[PDB]
Design a protein around this nucleic acid. Structure first.
Ligand SMILES: Nc1ncnc2c1ncn2[C@@H]1O[C@H](COP(=O)(O)OP(=O)(O)OP(O)(O)=S)[C@@H](O)[C@H]1O
Ligand SMILES: Nc1ncnc2c1ncn2[C@@H]1O[C@H](COP(=O)(O)OP(=O)(O)OP(O)(O)=S)[C@@H](O)[C@H]1O
Ligand SMILES: Nc1ncnc2c1ncn2[C@@H]1O[C@H](COP(=O)(O)OP(=O)(O)OP(O)(O)=S)[C@@H](O)[C@H]1O
Ligand SMILES: Nc1ncnc2c1ncn2[C@@H]1O[C@H](COP(=O)(O)OP(=O)(O)O)[C@@H](O)[C@H]1O
Ligand SMILES: [Mg+2]
Ligand SMILES: [Mg+2]
Ligand SMILES: [Mg+2]
Lengths: 330, 257, 341, 320, 391
DNA sequence: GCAGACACTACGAGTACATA
DNA sequence: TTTATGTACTCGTAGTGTCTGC
């Protein structure tokens, strides 16, 4: 690292250095603290969506158990490091079999993003874990469970990291604003909550980019308007107006309204499709055929947009799909 | 001109020192100071720890006012040392917190001059203060004898168990082919002072070690005529190879159970 | 050579008596070649795109582009498979095609374009049949022409636009090559025959060749040469319009599909398809010919025609995303049999 | 850093054949082999965590005693079991002359035998056939399909089945009485339901609940460990109302932090393992789930894709 | 000794009159090895009565555990020929094979000198048991061309292409599944010798489920007699289900089982669920998609829905075959998504064969897309050659 | 000591698997 | 038998090194 902090992104600057600094997962953190205070630590398996605080939790845990130099006492392997079955047969076996080199303690092995390991590597790791579990504990961080061997799943204690609720994001945002001498309006905070979609890195990145957006970093408050231009996400009022124009107004008015909304501040049809999806999910529909047609046609449109294409034709397709789906209901 | 200057008497010394622990370690963290140059490096399995230290007396000329952290890579370092005549005089050159160092492979003493440079590597791992402690035993046997014993026993088992009890060194390695039980009785000789099995005793020790790591240790036996092994039940094994002005330890971690 | 298709080819833009507007546009580009961008000529095959490319090349530098040589280049891939693909090189330009196996033409593109970019300031790189690229070599090309441009230039020739990805369309200038008019086909054939020694009863034969060729001048010249050889160098007004044996096989398959709509006839259809795929034919053109020959049968209905064309579109989409074309073609024939029955 | 207490999975591992619960006939046959001594070559197969390798180790311990240090050669995936460097090891071990009791033989525990290559098993064929008097083998593989048919032609097939709820409950109650932790029958049945006949999972969940809340009551159990998502997926796919299926999807998987690809794979597995609905209906369900799977793997992973998958599954299920 | 030896070892046949079934094959082997020396004196320029005069080498194949090794051993020992066996436990590499029994191809038995009237106890009979456990096959074939000693080979599957050079260099002797009567008699003798009762109707089901594997039958008898010496007709189904052998299936038989109309019936799906169909596909995942496509349109369909003709079912199966083509293309590409194999299994084998299931119109034909594709690839190469030459 | 002999590590080409 | 990367295994070869010897 260079120049200590203040030269890092807010994602890597506000990384929790203690188990007390991890928010949201209250149950998991309390259970882990009880585990390490009572002296028992089984093979841990942390599962959850990206950005929920798995590797931060395990790094804080290893820092708490050991001294400051946790990296000198932990064999932390990642997908960047080669993890073939020869690596399991040699490096993992030697680290598990031998005694600690710096003090008296149990060896800890952290396998971040272990879902990328091959099937044979996991098969070897099975017996490696089970044989030398007396003085060596394995931790597996996996975003995807279908890539893990069921034998490996049946061996490690499963901990699920839920997406961060509202209160955890609010507390972290309050801490960040206190540190950074920054002010932010509550409606902007709610917009950040809706924009996060359970991710914390998204929140930190949007805060950093919005502080960069302001001409004067101090004094000026971050409103939801600044959030919406900086992220580029559609405003809820724009989505409501577009949906109303589509539902009631005819083709000329609806097409002109959608084009004007998109060209006002450079909206994309994506993020607008699932904004409309959220708004329509907030409706009650008497006929299931409306739901079926909406879901199928909008999924096809989103797939086509993901593959890329002509935006005008896709917008016309969106309008046609919605208007054809809300006429079968009556 | 440059802040850090270290002109070796010969490139052979540095080549031998690097090749001593090149195989067992990938990343090396040199720390140049006015007292000398040290290098604390850890194996990938984090079992075998190497602590190089070269005194100021092994350099024909040496000067380094500001402490420098030279994190490097032994593969590319050995590749750089591979090219260049061994009789040539190497001169390590570095700047004030640089991105690289300069290897003066000055051929003979005139004419050809080389300027091989290796980009410096950002190793943020601080040096580990594992110097020594109250060791239970302190033996000292010739490097050739220890290397021969380790090479003979590695073919019989995957683990060599070193036992010291009542002024006696005993190596045992039980495996599939057989079980070696090479034993050594301490002695001293005035006729040939180099071969002398020195020993000290506080408490008996029964520590087992891997075979490949011990082979990695004995690969460095060419540097020193004598090797000093110190063991303890609550300390990693120490293998102090004595150099012309410094030393080269090997902190090996024993197996448990 | 003795073939008339490669004996009379216009070397310069002055001899391009095909399209006045396209020749004028190419001459506009050749007026100041110091800043000529990358081109991409598209249109029906047989129009003469390569002729325009070579004419523009010799208008940029000078005479001598038309002298060519063969230089086989050894290329190594994953494992140790050898797929040595020759390049038809020349002074002042370089001609390449993705005739190599499609799954690993990306390496051919990568190292060959990197080798030619090691240095009359630029060497044009013509890529025939660019629509056959597999969206992986095009990814390399995206930065290949963008990074090094003052030293290398591309004239990317392809007969279709759909497989070419959006960035390649974006960074390349688009030039359109319409097919010749029937009057122009007849004029070109008349000039060829009066430079040749074939006797014509009436120019109606040239018009019939123009109508049968369907805007394809290359097959028009080939058919004229074949007829002249078969008619003892004296064309007859009653000479039947000879078709390629491939067209005959397609039409016989269409007749068998139309008349008999049983499973056994589908078995002989599968056998004929196996033979045709063994006869070096792309899947897109054979499905297109089968579809358009099916729609030309007069015993069909408009509903059957609509169903056939819709399933033809579906199975052509399947061809664009499939490996073994025989399954898709057999499925299309099965659906056609189901609809007609 | 204090020395860790051994986990209850390994602390209470059985050491005698009597403590293994489930598959009473197989355990009794193993006991009769143990006192008889005439151990044949056997292959042990079953789902993970039901007591395969522990029975092998217990039988090896019981048949031969103080000779356990050198009279048994144990191999596993961590050892580089290849055709060349390892054929010599078993060849020497079988050719090794060690004096046993009259009715006992050397044991070669080729643990996790489904991961070996074909050539290793081809050599093991004649290795087993030659020295059948001196050494005996013991394969312990999760899947018996990888083992070639010549190896199956000279082995005793011992198929373990998933543990019944009564046996898991019995051994669990034994563990509670040895550990003296306050328990409620509702919590125990919650542990049984969560384990799905996987014994090690039951012990691990018991550990987590005991050391997380002290009491193993059902609320604490469901707080610590979640219900198995295959059951939730099966409930979602079998619902009759599309709104109900969408609500189950969202609330129980999307708001609980489950990846879309995990939901799709679990839906495919549930559909292929489901039997209530008609075979053809399962075929179109599998086809649609696979189309959504291709969409997910190609890059677009969204709640909308899963919602469309459920909508089309309801289209096929409701018969238009 | 007794009680400390495997049942499949102590009850091994002692003479050629103790082999269960395969009397014709053992008789043929005995005739061939009893007349090899006459063929040697004839210099292999003509055949004999049964044709043994042209082939100095023979090879034995069959299902496992039927008696190939025992027949070879007894035939070699009865005439006194000294056995010299090579096995998969030892190296059969080309260099070591040339450094192994290559000199022994025309030497003499020194132990035959020391052992011993035994007139023909002074020669090598060479035994490559487990030939399939392999340029070893080329060296073995070249040995078969030139050998001065009796030579036989034991393998399991002739149809593998790696024993294709053995097509006409050996006297093939085929061993089949033995008839249940001899095995019944042998198990009666074994049961009355080992104190446990056996019920005659049980042997038929044991052979049926074990698929004619006598060694596994003996192992089953031993294991059952460990704790329950009495074998009756009550637990016969329990034992058969517990010891059922999940043998792999050949591509033609895979196509036959996939196209059988019973498995897709309502009653037939209780035991043979679609999971079993996926497992059956996964045995040979490279030939099943090709095998299904080439004979899904040459059957009488027996699972036609009401109001649906055979052509409609053919088209609806072809649609999913085309979908499976795209799935395979995504699987075998740069992305390399091998988690998509179960989907390809359904879309390429199960669903297309779930609509055209029934008895064969003709018979299952080998895949022709491989040969057609190879010929097309060569024709493409020759087309490229002439295209570049004339350019 | 130079020469041969020796067995070792290192390297390269080929084959086969890829969901339970 | 084509497939089209990445992984793992296996073998074979070429040198490279120290060890015996005259
Ligand atoms: N519960 C939390 N409390 C505070 N900060 C958090 C929390 N969860 C995530 N973060 C922040 O998110 C940043 C990156 O997330 P990490 O926890 O390091 O990675 P991760 O959450 O495990 O996601 P993956 O699966 O590794 S990509 C951290 O540096 C923290 O600043
Ligand atoms: N029948 C049983 N009785 C008692 N404990 C059991 C039983 N089955 C499993 N266990 C426990 O399961 C743990 C180890 O089970 P193992 O036998 O090692 O799993 P496994 O059968 O080998 O499955 P895999 O394929 O190796 S993951 C120990 O804590 C045992 O106490
Ligand atoms: N026909 C038979 N009659 C009696 N016992 C038999 C018969 N065939 C096999 N056995 C028994 O099975 C044992 C082994 O038979 P083998 O001939 O070795 O099997 P195999 O033919 O070699 O098949 P492989 O080599 O495993 S593929 C013999 O020792 C007998 O106990
Ligand atoms: N202006 C023209 N006058 C006469 N013939 C022409 C003209 N332009 C093209 N051709 C004919 O077109 C043929 C070459 O076509 P080609 O460039 O191969 O088509 P494609 O590029 O579609 O394969 C030549 O034989 C040539 O006679
Ligand atoms: Mg992480
Ligand atoms: Mg196990
Ligand atoms: Mg045999």
């Amino acid at each position: 690292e260079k120049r200590s902090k203040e030269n890092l992104p807010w994602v890597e600057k506000y990384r929790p250095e203690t188990l007390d600094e991890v928010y949201g997962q209250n149950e998991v953190i309390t259970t882990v603290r009880k585990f390490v205070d009572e002296g028992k630590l089984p093979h841990l398996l942390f599962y959850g969506p990206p950005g929920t605080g798995k590797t931060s939790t395990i790094v804080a845990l290893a820092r708490e158990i050991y001294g400051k130099n946790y990296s000198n006492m932990v064999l932390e392997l990642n997908a960047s490091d080669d993890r073939g079955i020869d690596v399991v047969r040699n490096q993992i076996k030697d680290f598990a079999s031998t005694r600690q080199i710096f003090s008296k303690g149990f060896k800890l092995i952290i396998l971040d993003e272990a879902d990328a390991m091959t099937n044979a590597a996991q098969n070897a790791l099975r017996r490696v874990i089970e044989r030398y579990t007396k003085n060596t504990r394995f931790c597996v961080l996996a975003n995807y469970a279908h890539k893990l061997t069921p034998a490996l799943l049946s061996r490690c204690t499963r901990f699920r990291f839920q997406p961060l609720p509202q209160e955890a994001i609010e507390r972290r945002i309050a801490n960040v604003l206190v540190h950074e001498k920054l002010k932010l309006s509550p409606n902007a905070e709610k917009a950040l909550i809706e924009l996060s979609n359970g991710d914390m890195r998204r929140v930190l990145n949007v805060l950093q980019s919005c502080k960069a957006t302001l001409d004067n970093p101090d004094e000026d408050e971050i409103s939801d308007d600044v959030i919406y231009e900086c992220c580029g996400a559609p405003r809820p009022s724009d989505l409501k107006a577009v949906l109303k124009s589509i539902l009631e107004d005819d083709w000329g008015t609806a097409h002109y309204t959608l084009n004007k909304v998109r060209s006002a501040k450079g909206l994309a049809l994506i993020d607008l499709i699932e904004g409309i999806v959220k708004i329509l999910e907030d409706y009650e529909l008497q006929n299931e055929e409306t739901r079926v047609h909406l879901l199928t046609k909008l999924a096809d449109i989103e797939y086509s947009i993901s593959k890329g294409g002509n935006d005008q034709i896709q917008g016309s397709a969106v309008i046609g799909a919605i208007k054809a789906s809300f006429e079968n209901e009556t | 001109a440059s802040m850090l200057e270290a002109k070796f008497e010969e490139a052979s010394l540095f080549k031998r020192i690097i090749d001593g622990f090149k195989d067992c370690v990938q990343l090396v963290n040199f720390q140049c100071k006015e007292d000398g140059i040290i290098a604390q490096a850890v194996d990938d399995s984090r079992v075998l720890l190497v602590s190089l230290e070269i005194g100021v007396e092994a350099f024909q000329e040496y000067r380094c006012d500001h402490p420098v952290t030279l994190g490097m890579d032994l593969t590319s370092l050995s590749k750089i040392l591979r090219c260049g005549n061994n009789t040539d005089t190497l001169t390590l050159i570095a700047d004030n917190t640089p991105d690289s160092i300069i290897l003066l492979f000055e051929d003979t003493k005139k004419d050809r001059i080389a300027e091989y440079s290796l980009k410096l590597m950002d190793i943020d791992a601080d040096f580990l203060k594992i110097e020594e402690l109250q060791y239970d035993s302190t033996l000292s046997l010739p490097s050739s004898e220890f290397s021969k014993i380790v090479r003979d026993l590695s073919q019989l088992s995957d683990s060599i168990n070193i036992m010291i009890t009542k002024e006696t060194i005993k190596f045992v390695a039980d495996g599939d082919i057989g079980s070696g039980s090479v034993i050594i009785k301490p002695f001293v000789d005035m006729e040939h002072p180099e071969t002398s099995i020195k020993l000290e005793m506080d408490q008996p020790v029964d520590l087992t070690f891997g075979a490949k790591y011990l082979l990695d240790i004995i690969k460095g036996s060419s540097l020193s005529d004598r090797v000093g092994i110190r063991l303890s039940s609550e300390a990693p094994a120490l293998f102090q190879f004595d150099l012309k002005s410094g030393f080269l330890q090997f902190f090996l971690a024993p197996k448990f159970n | 050579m003795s073939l008339w298709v490669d004996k009379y080819r216009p070397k310069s833009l002055n001899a391009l008596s095909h399209n006045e507007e396209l020749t004028n546009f190419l001459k506009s580009l050749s007026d100041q070649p110091r800043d000529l961008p990358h081109l991409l000529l598209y249109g029906p095959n047989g129009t003469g795109k390569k002729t325009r490319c070579m004419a523009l090349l010799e208008s940029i530098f000078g005479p001598g582009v038309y002298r060519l040589k063969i230089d086989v280049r050894q290329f190594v891939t994953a494992s140790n498979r050898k797929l040595e693909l020759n390049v038809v090189s020349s002074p002042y330009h370089l001609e390449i095609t993705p005739s190599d196996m499609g799954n690993n033409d990306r390496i051919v593109i990568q190292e060959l374009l990197k080798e030619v970019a090691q240095m009359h300031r630029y060497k044009c790189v013509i890529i025939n049949e660019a629509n056959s690229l597999t969206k992986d070599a095009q990814a390399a090309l995206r930065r290949t022409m963008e990074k090094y441009s003052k030293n290398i230039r591309l004239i990317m020739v392809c007969d279709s636009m759909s497989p070419i990805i959006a960035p390649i369309k974006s960074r390349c200038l688009l030039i359109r090559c319409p097919a010749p008019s029937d009057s122009e086909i007849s004029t070109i054939l008349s000039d060829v025959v009066t430079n040749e020694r074939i006797q014509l009863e009436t120019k109606d034969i040239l018009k019939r060749i123009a109508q049968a060729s369907n805007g394809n001048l290359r097959v028009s010249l080939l058919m004229l040469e074949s007829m002249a050889l078969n008619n003892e160098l004296a064309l007859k007004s009653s000479s039947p319009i000879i078709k390629p044996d491939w067209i005959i096989v397609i039409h016989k398959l269409t007749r068998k599909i139309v008349k008999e709509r049983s499973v056994n006839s589908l078995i002989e259809c599968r056998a004929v398809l196996y033979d045709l795929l063994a006869h070096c034919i792309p899947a897109n053109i054979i499905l297109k010919e089968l579809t358009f020959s099916l729609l030309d049968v007069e015993t069909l209905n408009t509903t059957n025609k609509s169903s056939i064309i819709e399933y033809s579109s579906v199975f052509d989409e399947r061809l664009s995303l499939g490996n073994k074309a025989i399954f898709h073609l057999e499925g299309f024939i099965a659906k056609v049999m189901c609809c007609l029955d | 850093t204090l020395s860790l207490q051994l986990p209850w999975v390994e602390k209470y591992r059985p050491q005698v054949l009597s403590d293994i619960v489930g598959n009473k006939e197989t355990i009794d046959r193993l006991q009769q082999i143990a006192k008889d001594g005439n151990m044949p070559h056997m292959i042990i197969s079953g789902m993970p965590g039901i007591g395969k390798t522990t029975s092998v180790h217990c039988l090896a311990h019981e048949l031969l005693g103080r000779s356990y240090a050198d009279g048994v050669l144990e191999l596993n995936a961590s050892d580089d079991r290849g055709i060349d460097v390892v054929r010599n090891q078993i060849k020497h071990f079988a050719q090794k002359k060690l004096h046993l009791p009259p009715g006992k033989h050397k044991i070669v525990i080729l643990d996790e035998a489904d991961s070996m290559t074909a050539g290793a098993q081809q050599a093991l064929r004649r290795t087993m056939e030659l020295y059948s008097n001196s050494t005996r083998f013991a394969f312990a593989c999760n899947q018996s399909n990888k083992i070639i048919e010549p190896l199956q032609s000279r082995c005793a097939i011992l198929r373990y089945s998933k543990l019944s709820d009564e046996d898991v409950l019995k051994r669990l109650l034994q563990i509670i009485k040895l550990e003296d932790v306050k328990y409620t029958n509702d919590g125990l049945e919650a542990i049984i339901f969560t384990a799905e006949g996987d014994m090690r999972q039951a012990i691990n969940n018991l550990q987590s609940t005991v050391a997380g809340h002290g009491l193993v009551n059902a609320d604490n159990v469901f707080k610590i460990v979640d219900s198995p998502h295959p059951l939730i997926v099966k409930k979602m796919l079998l619902a009759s109302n599309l709104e109900d299926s969408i609500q189950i999807l969202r609330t129980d998987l999307w708001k609980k932090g489950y990846s879309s690809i995990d939901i799709v794979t679990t839906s495919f597995r549930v559909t292929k393992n489901l039997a209530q609905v008609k075979e053809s209906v399962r075929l179109e369900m599998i086809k649609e789930i696979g189309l959504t799977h291709m969409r997910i793997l190609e890059g677009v992973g969204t709640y909308l894709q899963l919602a469309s998958m459920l909508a089309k599954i309801h289209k096929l299920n409701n018969k238009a | 000794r007794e009680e400390d030896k495997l049942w499949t070892v102590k009850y091994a046949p002692t003479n050629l009159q103790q082999v269960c079934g395969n009397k014709g094959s053992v008789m043929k082997l005995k005739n061939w090895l009893a007349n090899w020396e006459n063929s040697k004196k004839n210099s292999f320029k003509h055949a004999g009565k049964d044709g043994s005069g042209v082939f100095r080498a023979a090879m034995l194949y069959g299902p496992p555990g039927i008696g190939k090794t025992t027949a070879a051993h007894l035939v070699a020992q009865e005439l006194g020929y000294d056995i010299l066996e090579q096995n998969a436990s030892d190296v059969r590499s080309k260099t070591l094979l040339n450094a192994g029994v290559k000199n022994a191809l025309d030497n003499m038995s020194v132990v035959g000198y020391f052992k011993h009237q035994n007139l023909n106890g002074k020669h090598f009979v060479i035994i490559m048991d487990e030939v399939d456990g392999m340029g070893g096959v080329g060296q073995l074939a070249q040995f078969c061309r030139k050998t001065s000693t009796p030579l036989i080979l034991i393998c399991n599957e002739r149809n593998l292409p790696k024993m294709r050079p053995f097509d006409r260099v050996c006297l093939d002797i085929q061993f089949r599944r033995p008839d249940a009567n001899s095995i019944k008699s042998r198990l009666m003798t074994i049961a009355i010798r080992e104190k446990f009762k056996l019920d005659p109707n049980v042997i038929d089901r044991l052979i049926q489920t074990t698929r004619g594997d006598i060694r596994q039958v003996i192992n089953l008898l031993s294991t059952i007699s460990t704790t329950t010496k009495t074998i009756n007709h009550e637990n016969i189904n329990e034992i058969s289900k517990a010891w059922e052998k999940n043998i792999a299936l050949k591509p033609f038989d895979i196509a036959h089982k996939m196209l059988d109309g019973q498995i897709y019936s309502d009653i037939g799906s209780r035991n043979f669920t679609l999971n079993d169909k996926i497992a059956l596909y996964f045995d040979d995942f490279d030939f099943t998609p090709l095998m299904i496509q080439e004979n899904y349109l040459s059957t009488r369909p027996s699972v036609l829905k009401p109001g649906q003709s055979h052509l409609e079912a053919v088209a609806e199966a072809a649609n999913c075959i085309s979908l499976g083509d795209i799935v395979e293309k995504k699987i075998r590409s740069s992305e390399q998504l091998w988690s998509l194999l179960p989907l390809h299994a359904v879309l390429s084998s199960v669903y297309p064969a779930s609509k055209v299931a029934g008895h064969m119109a003709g018979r299952i034909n080998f895949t022709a897309w491989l040969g057609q594709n190879s010929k097309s690839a060569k024709y493409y190469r020759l087309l490229q050659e002439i295209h570049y030459h004339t350019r």
